[PDB]
UniProtKB/Swiss-Prot annotation, chains A, B, C:
The lineage of its organism: Bacteria, Pseudomonadati, Pseudomonadota, Gammaproteobacteria, Enterobacterales. This is L-arabinose isomerase. Induction: Induced by arabinose. Transcription is dependent on the transcription factor AraC, the cAMP receptor protein (CRP) and cAMP. The gene is araA. CDD domains: L-arabinose_isomerase (cd03557). Gene3D superfamilies: 3.40.50.10940.
Length: 498, 498, 498
């Protein structure tokens, strides 16, 4: 059902062939226990596969070599059970293109004070075997996450799982394809950048199909398929008068449905996971994609406005990252502010394309469209309010020589009064320290008007993402002060400038 | 007539106000003498304007301040007639946005052995004044050029003017706009890159207009204007049978003409200096621009193949750069090779778009057109051979964190046999160390299949260009040997890495 | 027979799916033809295996994933028959742990002037395809080798063959295991270093077994096996009076034979490819291994003196690298100098251990003399002179933070007089530029007394070895002038440090 089902994390036990046939018989026993117990009762993002024992250099190397080849292998989890001379792991860890997590754990939870003896110690001694291995990861300067705790520790399952979540995100993105329909909005900087660099670093691809190629597909959709989707609109949304049968903008709705169906067929047949649109190039289309883009976002496709491939891929990444979690995740742009002592708010939205995934209700579908921008018909769109609660906004920017991920922790809030004249959906939030510091820190630290908004993911998730891809995370939240913030920008600039 | 006539170089004399009103009266005399003589008899790319004497700090700052503000000022050439203490220049030089050359010259050629005294020595002491000014330039790591010689020395004139050329090239590029008709060829790397970086570094802009916008201007061109251009095709070119009036592909000639006029009206109204096309987006166009692009390249515009804005911008830069010189500057792609002991040759061409400024003859305008690529009607193009003699091929590439300019010296040669079946123009050359070494260095050293070919400019011009923009020049010529070539790549990597 | 024959180089063809089922048929035809002919008629170090066409991104990534997994795959030679957009290669080149060479070739040698057309040019377009691929290697800063030439050019074969040698070399060294009997000689800096850094960098393993473990195996070898080897000694060497039956040191010949068998059985059962010994620790051994090490060197094992694992390894690597070539390859030490005008010579030798692979005649085998260093009985050894001709002397040293490969081009020479009182085998050469400059340069550039001498290999092989492992090559040859030599040492220091 889920794309987590297409991945596994390998459970690899580290130790040494020089123990004994019986001793190693005992460690597999524990391993088979803990792994089964975790798969059944730990509710982890995906499955753990116990691999044979990593005892000798050639076997550890063999595990890594298989791990690289196996496309369902999203990373390794190594339990350092006994004492596994890090030198065996060298050759393996050198070749290994898949992430690693050391689970620094212990079979028993309490120390058996009265029955502890050398034949115990000579089995289960992760306390120092774990540390020897920690060194070689540090010495080689490899990522290597670390989680400590007993294997039944619910808090440890939580940390282990979020790591698996990132490990899976990492693999998927290697195959993530973005389709652009036209180029960037002219004279814009932040949405521009080096697609080659992005593919090298993250693995996602970005290529552009001419709006006309889309238009051909849009124009081939049958009137029946068109009408069928409008029946699903009628059942999913609250149709305004102009929207219903006999309404003045009834045709503008069918045209929207058509476009959505053309964009769907196009993306499915091209195998794409995200896309962009541009209002400066819609020759052949009746209206700018609105409703269409909203529903596709909800169905899982990433998207960003004016040719903005970075955000579009980021949306898809974070959408996949959020699978099985409760929360929304949308393309988002800061539209305007409300200045008021103690209640500085940011209204978020876009031209049209906001994802219903973050909504509360059942969404009105209107046109009231006269969208002057683009020079087209009145586009259909979903209008709605955004759910209340803790959220994050993230932006990935290209600084030229490296990437930086800015994430601002925010809190969404109910609109204080209705919004009758606003023909687009809205999100409304209080930005973390406070608006001035939040905005100033965001502006100082580069980084853009386009973001991904998410109720599902949090600061902890984005920190792991940044580490997993070795990029600077710039954090804006309740603990942000600008002097420290500025210093961190500088000190990171020399660090990541290497 | 020339765009060199909208620019001038400022002749600034350095001295110090402590010499005497009459010593200063004599340096001005020399300066007026020198400057007048050079404008009259040195045949320099553009005019020298003698500014007032730079004797105090405020005076020198004022001159730099003016130089910045004056759009026609392409740079300064400074003569240090006497000692002009360098601190006086610090504030002027810290704000100076224009490039600078020290003309390390003297009024007298010969030393007047029998008359020389302190009077003569307090006047004209460039021998040491020029060295004090060198210090400050080097101390501030500013890219100051130096030419040493007597002011009448015709070799100095040459090098002085060669500099003035790059100065003017530098200013024009700050206003160079590129129009892209669609995006990069999909999946292609070299043609891609950071348009923001390029604008920051070189000052030229790259933005994309929808083929639709062009298509609109192509369709509005009137029949009379179309047939008028076909009257100049018939007068300029040798028309193949299919090209003439009752010919089977007369229609395809008229359609090329209209594409040309549409492209020219669009480019003129947009104020553009170079442009690109992409065969993966020709919706609304009858045929891929061939003839049209070739005549626009001859008329001055930069152009490159598959949304390749760097090479297109480069073509325009090098065209402008080559004004008043031996001409022959074109878009080029290395098409195929000829392997034979002591005669390894490269055939250069492209799909269609080869500029006729490098032609010998006066060229056939054929259709024999089946161009499968792009999937449009049969293109009109110009077939011709390239002139014999020394040339260069240049490629500017984005290494992500910086740019590299590759230049290969070459020698074009008349084809040994006719090319009756090849429906495109052709260059044919010997690459200068030899083909294997020249191709291996080019491959090793980044940088691509698209190039700017030129008879009119040489390696020393490109060297100054690279100096002027502070970028690596990777040189491939008769003196190239691979081990040392590779070492330079390494050592330059760390140098230009900060 | 060779260990080259357990390795294969993959012939990987770049193209693109958009060309057509028939165009792609023709490239596979050329491919089958090229590869087939090279396997038959090119005499390459090992076999080329043609992989399926690399046409789409997922196919190219598959090929790299497979390439990594397959133990016999030693590298890839890629021919970009057609333009093959390099972004398709990114995800694969990112994971590719195996070395790559672009063979910039063409199916035809001569341009078919009278028949060449778009058809021919749709197919066969390496001239541009190879350059786009060149870019991506250079942008990703990967080591991609390149050879340009028609595929029947015999010099291209030579150069491509040379690359494969290094490819096969690199894989074999990944499995190379060194066995140390004792630790490094006390207070020596050269032979000491980080064995982990080495394993990380090169993949060979160094681990010390105690001499008591070797002494056990030596003591367990039966008398009949010992005598069986003394038969093979009598038939291979010229035995001195004291060596022959009834000779005063006949029992010393048996004790060497018994030690030779003790080490060979120990090395076989351990799976070792190279080893070291130390005279400060020979407890339980009747004599220092002398003839035993020389014959094992001949038989292909790596070896250096007092716990010098780096050189021992290097011997094995360079012996394996040289398989099928004509030349010696011996462990060596710079024993003494001859100082004369125009006849400055260096006598090479060691305590005992000099490899008979570099000898001329059939060697005398003596226990001629009393080795008074850290031990007991007079050891047996092989006395001989070295071949004449061009050679190289090399050494890998560890500068703490990185490795450096010193290579001095030399010329061996017949000994101008007999050597009747020297009981060790000797080499004698005239070091390039000259003895004062070569020895200074060698001392200035870190490295040490222990070296690998080799007639078989040359400077070109060592240059390719250094690139393959991204280490500094420090070359000392006729072209070496010291100021420039010091300069490079500096400029490399900053390049490789960081």
């Amino acid at each position: 059902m889920t794309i987590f089902d297409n991945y596994e994390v390998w459970f690899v036990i580290g130790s040494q062939h020089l123990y004994g046939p019986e001793t190693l018989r005992q460690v597999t026993q524990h391993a088979e226990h803990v792994v089964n117990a975790l798969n059944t009762e730990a509710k982890l993002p995906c499955k753990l596969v116990l691999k044979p024992l990593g005892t000798t250099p050639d076997e550890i190397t063999a595990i890594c070599r298989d791990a690289n080849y196996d496309d369902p292998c999203a990373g390794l989890v190594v339990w350092l059970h006994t004492f596994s001379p890090a030198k065996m792991w060298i050759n393996g860890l050198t070749m290994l293109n898949k992430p690693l997590l050391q689970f620094h754990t212990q079979f028993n939870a309490a120390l058996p004070w009265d029955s502890i003896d050398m034949d115990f110690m000579n089995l289960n001694q992760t306390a120092h075997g774990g540390r020897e291995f920690g060194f070689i990861g540090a010495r080689m300067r490899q990522q290597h996450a670390v989680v400590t705790g007993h294997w039944q520790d619910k808090q440890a399952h939580e940390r282990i799982g979020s790591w698996m979540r990132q490990a899976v995100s990492k693999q998927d993105t290697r195959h993530l394809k973005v389709c652009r329909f036209g180029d960037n909005m002219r004279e814009v900087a932040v949405t521009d950048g080096d697609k080659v660099a992005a593919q090298i670093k993250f693995g996602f691809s970005v290529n552009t199909w001419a709006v006309g190629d889309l238009v051909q597909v849009v124009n081939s959709i049958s009137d029946g398929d068109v009408n069928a989707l409008v029946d699903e609109y009628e059942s999913c949304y609250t149709m305004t008068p102009a929207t219903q049968i006999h309404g003045e903008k009834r045709q503008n709705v069918l045209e929207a449905a058509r476009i959505e169906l053309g964009m769907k067929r196009f993306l499915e047949q091209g195998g794409f996971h995200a896309f962009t649109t541009t209002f400066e190039d819609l020759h052949g289309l009746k209206q700018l994609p609105g409703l269409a883009v909203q529903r596709l976002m909800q169905q899982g496709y990433g998207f960003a406005g004016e040719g903005d491939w970075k955000t579009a891929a980021l949306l898809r990444i974070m959408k996949v990252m959020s699978t099985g979690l409760q929360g929304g995740t949308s393309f988002m742009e800061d539209y305007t502010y409300h200045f008021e002592k103690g209640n500085d708010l940011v209204l978020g939205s876009h031209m049209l394309e906001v994802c219903p995934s973050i909504a509360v209700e059942e969404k009105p579908i209107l046109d009231v469209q006269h969208l002057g921008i683009g020079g087209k018909d009145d586009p259909a769109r979903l209008i709605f309010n955004t759910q209340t609660g803790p959220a994050i906004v993230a932006s990935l920017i290209d600084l030229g020589d490296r990437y930086r991920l800015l994430v601002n922790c925010i809190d969404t809030v109910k609109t204080p009064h209705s919004l009758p004249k606003l023909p687009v959906a809205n999100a409304l939030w209080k930005a973390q320290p406070d608006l001035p510091t939040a905005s100033e820190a965001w502006i100082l630290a580069g980084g853009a008007h386009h973001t991904v908004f998410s109720h599902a993911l949090n600061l902890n998730d984005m920190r792991q993402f940044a580490e997993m891809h070795d990029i600077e995370i710039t954090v804006i939240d309740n603990d942000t002060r600008l002097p420290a913030f500025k210093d961190a920008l500088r000190w990171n600039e020399v660090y990541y400038g290497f």
